[PDB]
Subunit: 128 residues, 3 copies
């Protein structure tokens, strides 16, 4: 369906992503797992979700602004293809000298459905 | 708003964002404040702008390619929701060994109106 | 104008970007040059490609997921404008404690044609409440 996207929980801990405000760009993504993101290190926060990417778009794992500014947290990777398989994972980057604790249920990113196009590349001799 | 990019200066130091060329993806964002982005550190550069953005889009704070390559500067966070009516700020990351000076009026990022969709989430037991 | 993605090789070492799969978002970008991204450092991996992109888009240099989790590699900069006619360069960031080797032909990023809009900015006194 065009105006809804299906989401299936892979555990009881999974939270259905939802928009924070009427005008929100993204859907909050929460970790389904307790973990720590090491200082100057990286970690995988699995959401325990399968998500069906809308036609004409990819799912972008985008950073929460609070965590970025206060905790020096960022999202690496972040491209969820329309044919991505399985559990959707958030790759967290911590550039601070302080570990970042992640509890089950913590919002760790936001999912944005980026509209894109996918043409077939045409190799040429000259561009004008 | 509807299909517009509206810009309201919050101080006389604010500069209206403009595309560097007709083929540009992004609008130049300038700091309205002097600051330093510490080596291996982060800073918040406010634009002293309040904005309304076109429907079907969020504003993405993207990095300038020059600052990225010469100075190891990046943008953290960067997602400006269509219903944000606060002061638009650029979260700067400095991964280099050297402090990065930012003067009032310096271009520190570029704003891109990313087209997106926002379907409502539909929870299911199975996709496909 | 042009809904097409056109690609001109700038050397014999260049590889035409292609999607890894039918449902893939991005086009694999391969380095056309031997280099190393220094531990805790950055490097330019030129693709030796000149490109023309579809109208209403820019080209985003987006990170590969394997390199990100496995090697702590990220893409810096990454905005390829409609009028960029130079050699497309991948700015690679290495946040690991170990160097990252790049051989010619290595996929180092993926190109995504982001749909965007570019309206004329309007300075106003008043923005509507939210
Ligand atoms: O780089 C940024 C990112 C966000 N913002 C602004 C706009 C955006 O709409 C707003 C987000 O406000 P929130 O307090 O709701 N942060 P978020 O919902 O992303 O969660 P968190 O507070 O943990 O980041 O902050 C910036 O000015 N610059
Ligand atoms: O990762 C990138 C980013 C940009 N580019 C290209 C495309 C883009 O159109 C061009 C921008 O070159 P400049 O250094 O002149 N841009 P500047 O740093 O002056 O500002 P901005 O990056 O905001 O356009 O460089 C790449 O090849 N790879
Ligand atoms: O976002 C991520 C990134 C990595 N991972 C883990 C599991 C996954 O199997 C692996 C990344 O595999 P990819 O298929 O995404 N490799 P990549 O896209 O980088 O390269 P390519 O598709 O060309 O082989 O790392 C995640 O779960 N989520
Ligand atoms: Mg990034
Ligand atoms: Mg970016
Ligand atoms: Mg990948
Ligand atoms: Mg990018
Ligand atoms: Mg650019």
């Amino acid at each position: 369906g065009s105006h809804m996207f299906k989401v299936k929980k892979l555990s009881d801990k999974a939270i259905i992503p939802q928009r924070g405000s009427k005008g929100a760009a993204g859907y909050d993504l929460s970790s389904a797992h307790e973990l720590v993101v090491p200082a100057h290190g990286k970690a995988l926060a699995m959401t325990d979700l399968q998500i069906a990417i809308p036609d004409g778009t990819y799912g972008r794992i985008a950073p929460r602004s609070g965590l970025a500014w206060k905790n020096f947290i960022d999202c690496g990777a972040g491209v969820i293809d329309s044919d991505y398989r399985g559990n959707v994972g958030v790759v967290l980057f911590n550039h601070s000298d302080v570990d970042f604790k992640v509890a089950v249920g913590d919002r760790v990113a936001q999912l944005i459905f980026e509209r894109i196009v996918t043409p077939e590349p045409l190799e040429v001799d000259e561009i004008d």
